[PDB]
Amino acid sequence: TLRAAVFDLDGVLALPAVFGVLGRTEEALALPRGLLNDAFQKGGPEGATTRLMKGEITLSQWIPLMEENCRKCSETAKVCLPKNFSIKEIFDKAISARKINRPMLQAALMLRKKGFTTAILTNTWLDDRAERDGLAQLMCELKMHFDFLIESCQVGMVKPEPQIYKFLLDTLKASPSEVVFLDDIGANLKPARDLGMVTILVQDTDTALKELEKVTGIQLLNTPAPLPTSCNPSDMSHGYVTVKPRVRLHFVELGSGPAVCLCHGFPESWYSWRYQIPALAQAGYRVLAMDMKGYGESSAPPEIEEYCMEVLCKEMVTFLDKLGLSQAVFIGHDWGGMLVWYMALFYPERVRAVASLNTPFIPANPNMSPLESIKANPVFDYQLYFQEPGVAEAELEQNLSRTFKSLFRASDESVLSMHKVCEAGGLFVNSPEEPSLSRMVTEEEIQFYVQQFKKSGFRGPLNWYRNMERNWKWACKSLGRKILIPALMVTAEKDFVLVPQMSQHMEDWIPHLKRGHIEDCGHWTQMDKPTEVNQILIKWLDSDAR
Amino acid sequence: TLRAAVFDLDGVLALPAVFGVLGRTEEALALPRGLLNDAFQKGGPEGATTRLMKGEITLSQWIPLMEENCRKCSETAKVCLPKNFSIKEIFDKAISARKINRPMLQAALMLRKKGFTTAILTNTWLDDRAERDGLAQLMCELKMHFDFLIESCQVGMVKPEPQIYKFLLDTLKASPSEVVFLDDIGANLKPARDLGMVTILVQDTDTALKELEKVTGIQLLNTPAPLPTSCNPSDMSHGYVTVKPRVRLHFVELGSGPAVCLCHGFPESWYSWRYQIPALAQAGYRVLAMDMKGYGESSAPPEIEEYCMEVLCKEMVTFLDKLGLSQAVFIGHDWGGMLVWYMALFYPERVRAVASLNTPFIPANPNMSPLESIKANPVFDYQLYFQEPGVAEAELEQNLSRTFKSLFRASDESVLSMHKVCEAGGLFVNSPEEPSLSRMVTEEEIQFYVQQFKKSGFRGPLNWYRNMERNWKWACKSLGRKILIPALMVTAEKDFVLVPQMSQHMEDWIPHLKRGHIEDCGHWTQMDKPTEVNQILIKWLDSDAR
Numbered sequence A, B: 001t002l003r004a005a006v007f008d009l010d011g012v013l014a015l016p017a018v019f020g021v022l023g024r025t026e027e028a029l030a031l032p033r034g035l036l037n038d039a040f041q042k043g044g045p046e047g048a049t050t051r052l053m054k055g056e057i058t059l060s061q062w063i064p065l066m067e068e069n070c071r072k073c074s075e076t077a078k079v080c081l082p083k084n085f086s087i088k089e090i091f092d093k094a095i096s097a098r099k100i101n102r103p104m105l106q107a108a109l110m111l112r113k114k115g116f117t118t119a120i121l122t123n124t125w126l127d128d129r130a131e132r133d134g135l136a137q138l139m140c141e142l143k144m145h146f147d148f149l150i151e152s153c154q155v156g157m158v159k160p161e162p163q164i165y166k167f168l169l170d171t172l173k174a175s176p177s178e179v180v181f182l183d184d185i186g187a188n189l190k191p192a193r194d195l196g197m198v199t200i201l202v203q204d205t206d207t208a209l210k211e212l213e214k215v216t217g218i219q220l221l222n223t224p225a226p227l228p229t230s231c232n233p234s235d236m237s238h239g240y241v242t243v244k245p246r247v248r249l250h251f252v253e254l255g256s257g258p259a260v261c262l263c264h265g266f267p268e269s270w271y272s273w274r275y276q277i278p279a280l281a282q283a284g285y286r287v288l289a290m291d292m293k294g295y296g297e298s299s300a301p302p303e304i305e306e307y308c309m310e311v312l313c314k315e316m317v318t319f320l321d322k323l324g325l326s327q328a329v330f331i332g333h334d335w336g337g338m339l340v341w342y343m344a345l346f347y348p349e350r351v352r353a354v355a356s357l358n359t360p361f362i363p364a365n366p367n368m369s370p371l372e373s374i375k376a377n378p379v380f381d382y383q384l385y386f387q388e389p390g391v392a393e394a395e396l397e398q399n400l401s402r403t404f405k406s407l408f409r410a411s412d413e414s415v416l417s418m419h420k421v422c423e424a425g426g427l428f429v430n431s432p433e434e435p436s437l438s439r440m441v442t443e444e445e446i447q448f449y450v451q452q453f454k455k456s457g458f459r460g461p462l463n464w465y466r467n468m469e470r471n472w473k474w475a476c477k478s479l480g481r482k483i484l485i486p487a488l489m490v491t492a493e494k495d496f497v498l499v500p501q502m503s504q505h506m507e508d509w510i511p512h513l514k515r516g517h518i519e520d521c522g523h524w525t526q527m528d529k530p531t532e533v534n535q536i537l538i539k540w541l542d543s544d545a546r
């Protein structure tokens, strides 16, 4: 019975194969068949390439030795090499053109999801080329999805020597009959077969995957589109900044490039961006996913006034100052979306670009009290129930599991009505004691929110809604301004509180506004439609935020 | 008696003044004298510029209104404006050309160092230009050195209105007679004078500073060269990455740009880079200053084997993987310098560039035991004393204050001999019980190290030296390799253990090696010569590490 899957890198997890360039070069330059391939394998186990693959020498040391072998091969074949020929150029192009074979990675991901131990076993080199980062990035993206990465140049062993297979078996802590081994080189497949391992010769991906699903008994081909990579909280870099004596802000950090500050809504976490964090980092950005003030590992003072927009924005500016960041792209959702538009209005110097999911830019009505404006819209009744200190805290803190399971549901899962909340006497008055688990979340993900909210509860989070008059007075100072920095408004078709139509007049304040729209998407945008969110944010970041 | 100093931004802390471009443009374009300056102040307190300065409108909204005023001014003066004229271009150039007036900042720094409350009071705007980051960076660099930053566009008040001066006095929590106010605009100086504040009209910096030192009684002009900005531990962003179940690594993080990973030596801290962190971040780099394994807030397992180079390097690679970093520039000192050369040799793909302070690249001698190689050099006797578990821990942990005060001394301060340590029976056997405080450190800085070492002690740090045979076996695998990635070797003239001559043969292993040399510099390079270290590292980073 199988419980481990091993994949090669070249020609298996990454395509096109580097060997499938050496032959292409011969054809393009009209050189004798196999001329370059013979110079590559020259000397066999004693040759320059085996020394390179075992880690005895680096790729830059190997380049001239390979060039030397190319001359010896041409002298024997009675042919002459061109005047502009470069081994470095051939390998730079080959490595750069090599990309992840996506359906092969998805198959490995599906196998690991069903309990398999997955590993990459590869004959590779120590890359010291000026262009080494390209491969470094590819290896980083691939390695994270596997239990083990075994590189020949690191272990001092090479395929097909039998010692690497015994090393692989020891690393996996599995007998050979429990292991599937996928390779594009038949010679490298043989010693695994010899030990009793199930072996797959990879030519075209689809056939290799048909063979893989037949042997494992798990559907890998024609499967539904998978969700993006999520975050394991204990595998993240956790950051902490003291913004004032009693206030510390926590954030999760991933990637390199322009800083992208993610601001969640109510009653959420940095974890609400779990599907965006790996995607945005992979797209070339430095992600800073916040625990907003009053949440998770961030400080939660009890005073209502600590949660007015002016203070929250000032603290976000200090956060940037303390990290040494002159700017950040600000992306918000719900209450985070509201903060993000105010950051753009009051601190444009510090905001590289601004994006909001669901929350439209809501300007202050100078001729109406903010509480009257809330009252005029039946869907915003929950905000009035959130006003009296203690009332919503008691209902929300009573049963944390019930709170999150009731709130975090897709558009076709109900289970609460946001209108007549005060009349009904609560958010969960007509909700079950043990709500069913939404398709958007696992039991484990609910438990993360439960554990986070055990620290400070709902006082700090609910206080965000308890500064309406204060926020209105501050917002009135910005009534003559316009948002002229790059901006994105993303609407969700089925958000019945933050309706797409609420954003219709935004172009009056933000003339150069860009938009995104997600159909069949509820209030919990990031987890409802993660793939679509990622596609819209990445496209907008690459075009408007560098 | 004075205890507060207030400085203007334009024409005082930053030069040349933005107003000193509007007049220059008239002269360059042969436009009537004051034509552009009249369009600037047009409408006075009701005009577009006052609305801009009060924060009613943003700079991008103001640009066309200013352009409108330029036409009205030319129509009255019976002159015509050019066909290629652009207000945006004039202000983009003016802002970009404006840099920090360094001797004015040093004076503010010296005043704050002597107990003064310092503040920047400025008539500024909300900058939403595509080029706003330039000013954002300047404001970030300046603001950190002051207790308060009061911006007109943020407070809704403008100089010379008396309300901003009463706001300033309330912010400072000081009576007017306790305040010095420096401004280049006489009209803006008057209301401060009117309240009884000491006022300085700033034309040339030197005279303003002569006036400032006469009134404060503190030397500000002709003072010795100041040390670079240091770090206040509680003002830093603190990061934490779990690299394996029982191992977490702590780091301090500052700046944006290419990642620069700083690796300290024995028995140090991330704080040993305190003078490099703000400088390197200011030069355009993302600094990650580590607490190495066994130190400060990083995990400190007791096992000797947890501290061999192979494990330490593997953990540093995981650290990068977990942060989503494909590469980092690695800069090391002492034991950190040793790790950094091994990172370059075993993981060139992950090392953008490598730099070492004091520690030469020491290759393995395959024909000699590492302990024999140590014994052959009298200066490395302390490493033999560090071998027996418990012995050095007992002496080093006995009196922490004495440990750090004895170790951290400049080349002309002795107080220990590194030869015949085993014979003498310890490092501090001929050292005083209460050592004098070195000129390199304050009592407070010693106490930070004392507090850090109270957590785990010296077991983990001393274990770095207890893997000689293990490190030698691993290093022998790299004997056929060369370091071909960008590399910097920095030698310290007076380091009597890590002597500059020990690095003489490095070009045999690192042919393209770059060098730096610091005269009259001991073992504690970063704190001994911080200015010189910063100059060498920044120059090398900007040329070889992007």
Ligand SMILES: Cn1nnc(-c2cc(-c3ccsc3)cnc2N)n1
Pocket (backbone or CB within 6 Å): A334, A335, A338, A359, A362, A370, A373, A374, A377, A380, A468, A498
């Ligand atoms: C109908 N309406 N008028 N004003 C508002 C309003 C809404 C929010 C809000 C919107 C999404 S999360 C918090 C905050 N402050 C407000 N004043 N809603």
Ligand SMILES: Cn1nnc(-c2cc(-c3ccsc3)cnc2N)n1
Pocket (backbone or CB within 6 Å): B334, B335, B338, B359, B362, B370, B373, B374, B377, B380, B468, B498
């Ligand atoms: C004379 N000598 N031979 N080998 C060494 C040696 C030195 C160090 C070292 C050097 C600066 S901090 C630690 C480590 N490992 C070694 N093997 N020193």
